[model samples]
Target: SMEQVAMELRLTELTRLLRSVLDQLQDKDPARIFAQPVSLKEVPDYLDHIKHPMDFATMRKRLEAQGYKNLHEFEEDFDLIIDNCMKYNARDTVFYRAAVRLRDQGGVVLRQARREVDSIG
Candidate 1:
């Protein structure tokens, strides 16, 4: 049906946009700090400070699973990834600085995607 086709096309486009944002983030993260879940052994008190932890690997899995109902949901998870980093790491630390950079760059990508998607609708 036309409606079904239209819905599928929208989902495909949204997934593509989300994947582009994730790719840019992964590339920007040279240290791969945001690539995977934080190790509890490395940071024993991480969970104590951060109520919600997010990472690229987890995001990728969620994307593949169609866990995100919309672009806003995807953006929230992306923001959480950076926010958690900033929350757990000190302002003077490299981790915090990296998160700041990621937040800024990722924000640009996400905003662009949002604009592109919105203009289409």
Candidate 2:
């Protein structure tokens, strides 16, 4: 999936920033901006990597329910949401919140699916 590839690339980039970010810590306070300059600048790097690890997982299930066999069909829509999250540096903010949102939302969707299925009995 493109999301997976994009994230892997992001992680690789973040890993590079991390190396330099850590290197400066020895010379200055790790939390200070000047010392940890790359940390703030690299927000989008984490954006692609761990932002939505379960995104395709959730979408896959939703796709399965709809009998859709290909993830490519939904890649653009998924990328939109990913882009929105990236714009605000919302890796720990919007991204983490949405994970909880989807987890709860997924439960309801699954339960509703079950109830709808049971009605045929």
Candidate 3:
């Protein structure tokens, strides 16, 4: 019973930490291009280039579903959002630039969350 309770608490903490990280990323991306899934009709060849696609909305759903087991798992999805963007879009394009900025800033957010959780432990 004690171990189960501790595990539940840890999961709650991880979920909250992940939510804040997602919030920071959403705030940084004012255009909200990465907020939702990419439309295949708009970018017909997107799926061909980026095999693993990720977006904020999808991440939120996963988080709600308790799909992430740890901070690193959440970070993987976050990174994928940017990585897929950079992979599919040209360097000169706005999406590519936005992804670059998000990657830079979102990195700090993720690391900070990690530190915060570590300190608690």
Best of the candidates, lDDT: 3
What shift in Å separates residue 30 of candidate 2 from its native position after superposition? 36
TM-score of 1: 0.87
Poorly placed runs, candidate 2 (over 4 Å): 1-91
Worst 10 residues of 3 by lDDT: 12-21
**Reference-based lDDT, each prediction:** 0.85, 0.40, 0.88
Worst 10 residues of 1 by lDDT: 104-113
Task: For candidate 2, list the clashing residue pairs, or say none.
Answer: none
Q: Candidate 3, residues 36-119: lDDT per residue as tens digits?
A: 999989989877888899999999999987788888898899889998988888999999999999989887887788898788
* TM-score of each model, in listed order: 0.87, 0.27, 0.92
User: Which regions of candidate 1 fall more than 4 Å away from where they truly are?
Assistant: 1-5
Across residues 1-121, which tens digit of lDDT does each residue of candidate 2 receive? 9998976665555444333322332223222222111233645475455444323434435443443322234434344334444554456774445534443443444354335334632
**TM-score of structure candidate 3:** 0.92
Give me the overall lDDT of model 1: 0.85
Q: Candidate 1 on 10-99: residue-level lDDT in tens?
A: 887778777887898788898898999998898898888888889999999998776777888988888898888887778999999999
CA lDDT, candidate 3, residue 27: 91
